[PDB]
Copies of this chain bind each other. A is one copy, B any other.
């Protein structure tokens, strides 16, 4: 684009009119030199920091680095706190407030005199929500990731965030660990500022952002307390000023190819299943046609090479020390699986960015022959039970369970599950299929991460830690097991999942991508005719708004009226 030119912030701050005297004069009460309103890029630094978002605890100091960079490049930096949907505080689930966060971000951007955006994110649902909001404005934007926590250590051994919550709690149910020992582990599990240090959702979404080209190279893996995280933040501050001048917009970066690069990256790293929903939602904002079939297709026969929990052994520190995501992206290029010419926020192509990096640890970023799985991409299951699709993360599942037929053990909701699961009178064995409903977008509500249901204690005492599980819910990115997720349509909207009964047989067949409830179309069709929504609905408030407008996980679980891009035209003046 042409520079110099009149930027949208000048609608507020350029001129001699009464409106400009009002806008410019009031901001000046914070002590800003007059020439800051001379047309230089005005940068909105969107911060998801909060004392109730400990994964983002260091983001104010990151903001200062960003500010410094904007000043250096001759911009005008303004820190703007935005809704922070922390995974670790919000109940019923942070997922329920992602669209709310996305909405407020969109309005904060379009409604206020900023010419460009810096997206300060970290905790799980902060990355997609700001990406959704910024994409729906399509102003020049760039991502700064907070970074993972340092490795957790318990009794001289590695402890992964979230992953060891499942492991220890299941060990306790098996009688192989006491709750007292579990409590002792708490202190040294989260011992620095940052996000979960496994390949969970936050680490995955950081990787997607970088793989999408919406963040500078090397952004994802640097630990929150690492010095180079701050270097990154300041360098990002410099870049956004130039991006605003060059008018480098999200639509030019997040293309279909870019999303394809992102999906294969998810396969290579063995990333969270939540990335599926989040990418679909974000794609729905950019205006790109992206579907579950694209995920299944692109991820097919792409091996996981990142050896981190829950799929592998190590943590984000080792991943970073090995060389981080650029090494992974370079490998994808070498396999001919990368759209090498994909443009990034640096103004350079993704390949030009990563082509010369070195793998410093092949025990962490494995050679292709030694992949944890040959086809690491999340798999999309189709069938009478999931007509709109369901997902599974193969790199953390059990090979002997990937093809499996068993009797359905059914839970009507999470309350139903929690009441039955620890009961020794529960008619269930290791060959049964655990099935749960009413845990989707509308059902839970908000679609909580309860898909990785803990096994029956009497099964766990046999040393059996994996069983086939199916639901219309999510599970933590740090979670594992042969779990089928995002079953669409959910039970709460009358999907076939609603009418699953104890005793019914279910066939799981991942290689053929099929999930089959073994009853006749006749029996199924008549079951659905008698269906009713036996869940509690809200009468007012945001819970109500959510219940009315939220879509299925198969499309990204967005709000129907929030889909698409609405541009960044400046609204009418207030007086």
In the complex, the chain B residue whose C-beta lies closest to that of A570 is: B91
With A and B bound together, what is the CA distance between A419 and B176 in angstroms?
68
Q: How many residues of A are counted as interface, with CB atoms below 8 angstroms from the partner's CB atoms?
A: 119
In the complex, the chain B residue whose C-beta lies closest to that of A49 is: B81
Q: Which stretch (A82-90, A383-391, A396-404, A455-463) binds chain B? A: A82-90
- In A215-239, the 8 Å CB interface with B consists of 225-231, 233-235
With A and B bound together, what is the CA distance between A567 and B360 in angstroms?
49
B545, A561: Cβ atoms under 8 Å?
yes
B91, A108: Cβ atoms under 8 Å?
no
Contact of A52 among B112, B182, B229 (CB under 8 A): B112
With A and B bound together, what is the CA distance between A543 and B569 in angstroms?
13
Max chain B CB contacts within 10 Å: which of A74, A103, A233?
A: A103
**B-contact bits for A46-76, CB 8 A (1 contact / 0 none):** 0101111011010000000101100110100
B187, A575: Cβ atoms under 8 Å?
no
**B-contact bits for A131-162, CB 8 A (1 contact / 0 none):** 00000100000000000011001011000001
Whether a CB of chain B sits under 8 angstroms from the CB of A449 is yes
- In A93-107, the 8 Å CB interface with B consists of 93-94, 97, 100, 103-104, 106-107
With A and B bound together, what is the CA distance between A541 and B50 in angstroms?
26
Whether a CB of chain B sits under 8 angstroms from the CB of A183 is yes
With A and B bound together, what is the CA distance between A162 and B22 in angstroms?
8
Whether a CB of chain B sits under 8 angstroms from the CB of A179 is yes
A571, B192: Cβ atoms under 8 Å?
no
**B-contact bits for A186-222, CB 8 A (1 contact / 0 none):** 1101111110000000000000000000000000000
In the complex, the chain B residue whose C-beta lies closest to that of A31 is: B230
CB distance from A455 to the nearest CB of B (A): 14
Whether a CB of chain B sits under 8 angstroms from the CB of A379 is no
With A and B bound together, what is the CA distance between A65 and B22 in angstroms?
23
**B-contact bits for A435-468, CB 8 A (1 contact / 0 none):** 0000000001000111000000000000000000
- In A271-324, the 8 Å CB interface with B consists of 321
With A and B bound together, what is the CA distance between A32 and B97 in angstroms?
26
Contact of A540 among B107, B193, B541, B562 (CB under 8 A): B562
Whether a CB of chain B sits under 8 angstroms from the CB of A425 is no
A189, B25: Cβ atoms under 8 Å?
yes
With A and B bound together, what is the CA distance between A234 and B168 in angstroms?
30
B563, A81: Cβ atoms under 8 Å?
no
In the complex, the chain B residue whose C-beta lies closest to that of A179 is: B16
- CB pairs A–B below 8 angstroms (5 shown): A12-B89, A91-B574, A92-B573, A93-B572, A97-B111
Interface residues of A (CB under 8 A from B): 11-12, 16, 18, 21-33, 44-45, 47, 49-52, 54-55, 57, 65, 67-68, 71-72, 74, 77-84, 86-94, 97, 100, 103-104, 106-108, 111-114, 136, 149-150, 153, 155-156, 162, 165, 168-169, 179, 182-183, 185-187, 189-194, 225-231, 233-235, 321, 360-361, 414, 444, 448-450, 476, 540-545, 561-564, 566, 570-575
Apart from A31-B228, A83-B108, what 10 extra A-B contacts exist at CB < 8 Å?
A21-B185, A26-B54, A29-B190, A30-B230, A52-B112, A81-B84, A91-B111, A92-B574, A106-B541, A155-B360
Q: What 6 A-B pairs come out closest when comparing CB atoms? A: A31-B230, A81-B81, A92-B571, A51-B78, A225-B225, A71-B71
